[PDB]
């Protein structure tokens, strides 16, 4: 079950590592270009925290929900800010969010009382009048119900497919940093002048195996010069000596 | 231009970095690492300007 545009849930993902590579083998998506930044730097850019927002969109008008564009479901629904720190991902989810008669569990709000500030969880609905007609629990002339359920039909096809879209909001170096993407690991080469980097241990030198062992609370090793000379290996549990030149 | 000036183009990515004062006049379709992709645009392939 996937969140809609009216009941959009701010999913909070924290205290892990966020690799966006397992989604590529699913299907050719409707779109791939992230809107705030380029899609070629999704991994190296480390952010403090991530906010996920899930949306089922009727039709194919996810273009109008953009940082710079508005619409019927972008001014009276979830509204993307024009200074949005994050990006989008949309993909054709016809296998889950469709029905043969209609996806009547969902809803859309075509219009509201007034234009809403972005990042506002607008979920309250009410009967709407026509200009100045008094409307209190009545329906018919000048009192029409402004909501209608989603209708999925096989005769609709292209132009009414869901294209499930998740937006991701980031923060640029102001909070504690818990979640981002990892890097690659290059295998150790012994007795070779390598420019080593053990999670930030910048320096150049050759690598040997050290007979001494560290305690489980120990990770580094110093000397008289107060610099790194023998450290525990990052992704494997043995102690490696940095022999200098 | 009042509805937007699209006569000036800029580049978003390359294969790698570039040395100073160099000109990258060559324009071609750019793929992402390992996916076989040439000729037209699509998944992980779009025009870099």
């Amino acid at each position: 079950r996937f969140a809609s545009v009216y009941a959009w849930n701010r999913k909070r993902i924290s205290n892990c590592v966020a690799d966006y590579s397992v989604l590529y083998n699913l299907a050719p998506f409707f779109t791939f270009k992230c809107y705030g930044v380029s899609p070629t730097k999704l991994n190296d850019l480390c952010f403090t925290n991530v906010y996920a927002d899930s949306f089922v969109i009727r039709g194919d008008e996810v273009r109008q929900i953009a940082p710079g564009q508005t619409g019927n479901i972008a001014d009276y629904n979830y509204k993307l800010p024009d200074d949005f720190t994050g990006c989008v991902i949309a993909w054709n989810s016809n296998k889950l969010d469709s029905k043969v008669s209609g996806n009547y569990n969902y809803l859309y709000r075509l219009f509201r009382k007034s234009n809403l500030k972005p990042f506002e969880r607008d979920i309250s609905t009410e009967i709407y009048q026509a200009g100045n007609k008094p409307c209190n629990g009545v329906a018919g002339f000048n009192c029409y119900f402004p909501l209608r359920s989603y209708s999925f039909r096989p005769t609709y096809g292209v132009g009414h497919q869901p294209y499930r879209v998740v937006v991701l909001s980031f923060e640029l170096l102001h909070a504690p940093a818990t979640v981002c993407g990892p890097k690659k690991s290059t295998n150790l080469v012994k007795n070779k002048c390598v420019n080593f980097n053990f999670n930030g241990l910048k320096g150049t030198g050759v690598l040997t195996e050290s007979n001494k062992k560290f305690l489980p609370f120990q990770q580094f090793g110093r000397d008289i010069a107060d610099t790194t000379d023998a450290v525990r290996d990052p992704q494997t549990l043995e102690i490696l000596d940095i022999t200098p030149c | 231009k009042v509805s937007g000036n699209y006569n000036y183009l800029y580049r978003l990515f390359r294969k790698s970095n570039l040395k100073p004062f160099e000109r990258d006049i060559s324009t071609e379709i750019y793929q992402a690492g390992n996916k076989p992709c040439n000729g037209v645009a699509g998944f992980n392939c779009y025009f870099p300007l």
Epitope: N115 | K1, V2, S3, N7
Partner: antibody, heavy 118, light 110 residues
Framework: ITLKESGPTLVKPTQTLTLTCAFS??????????VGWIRQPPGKALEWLAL???????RYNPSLKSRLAIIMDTSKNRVVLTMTNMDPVDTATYYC???????????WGQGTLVAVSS | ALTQPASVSGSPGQSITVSCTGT?????????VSWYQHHPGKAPKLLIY???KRPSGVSNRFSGSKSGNTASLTISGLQAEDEADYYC???????????FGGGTKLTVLG
């Protein structure tokens, strides 16, 4: 500087308007200047129609793309606006003007008025 | 959008001031707003470009200033032919890129 505006007096309801305006004397070695067309009917305020730069780019008002065409001479003589499928609410006067971006309409022509024959 | 009073009147000679305003969301940072004057049967002419910059050929009695979201112009030393159709034109990014006033018709009591 002179601006000359020419157009028909009365037009058929199914006819197409062919307005012409000529400009004499400008610094054409520039960027962002151009020739604009605006109209207004009596009883309602001004509203902008179109503007052309010196690079051939045409900017019309939105949702009026199909029924607005521009002939640009590339000889610094005259600019023609041809608009098809006219509406009797468009019976109005038309001004051809110079268009920079600070001066929204710097110098204004005399313009011509048109009405429908229906 | 952009709006101004439909008409204004006052004593001849002095004591007149005409203003325009608009919604800040539609208004793209409020730069390059200009003030024109239209005559019946005559071509309109430019009077003020970008709030408070004076072009050549105009008199020093025309002045303009903008505070907050509202711009305005003042003129001192009115005459018998100073009735006008003062318009404000501006840039609006969300709707049609240019906006042209709301209509003015100054009248005198001479």
């Amino acid at each position: 500087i002179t601006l000359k505006e020419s157009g028909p007096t009365l037009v058929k309801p199914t006819q197409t308007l062919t307005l012409t305006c000529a400009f004499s004397g400008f610094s054409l070695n520039t960027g962002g200047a151009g020739v604009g067309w605006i109209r207004q009917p009596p009883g309602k305020a001004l509203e902008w129609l179109a503007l052309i730069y010196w690079d051939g780019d045409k900017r019309y008002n939105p949702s009026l793309k199909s029924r607005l065409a521009i002939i640009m001479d590339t000889s610094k003589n005259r600019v023609v606006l041809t608009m098809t499928n006219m509406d009797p609410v468009d019976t109005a006067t038309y001004y051809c003007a110079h268009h920079k971006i600070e001066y929204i309409f710097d110098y204004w022509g005399q313009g011509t008025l048109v009405a429908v024959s229906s | 959008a952009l709006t101004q009073p439909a008409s204004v009147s006052g004593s001849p000679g002095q004591s007149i001031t005409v203003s325009c305003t608009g919604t800040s969301s539609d208004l793209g940072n409020f730069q390059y707003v200009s003030w024109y004057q239209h005559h019946p049967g005559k071509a309109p002419k430019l009077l003020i470009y970008e709030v408070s910059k004076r072009p050549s050929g105009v008199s020093n009695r025309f002045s303009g200033s903008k505070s907050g979201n509202t711009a305005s112009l003042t003129i001192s030393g009115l005459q018998a032919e100073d009735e006008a159709d003062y318009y404000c034109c501006s840039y609006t990014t969300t709707t049609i890129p240019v906006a042209f006033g709301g209509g003015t018709k100054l009248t005198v009591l001479g």
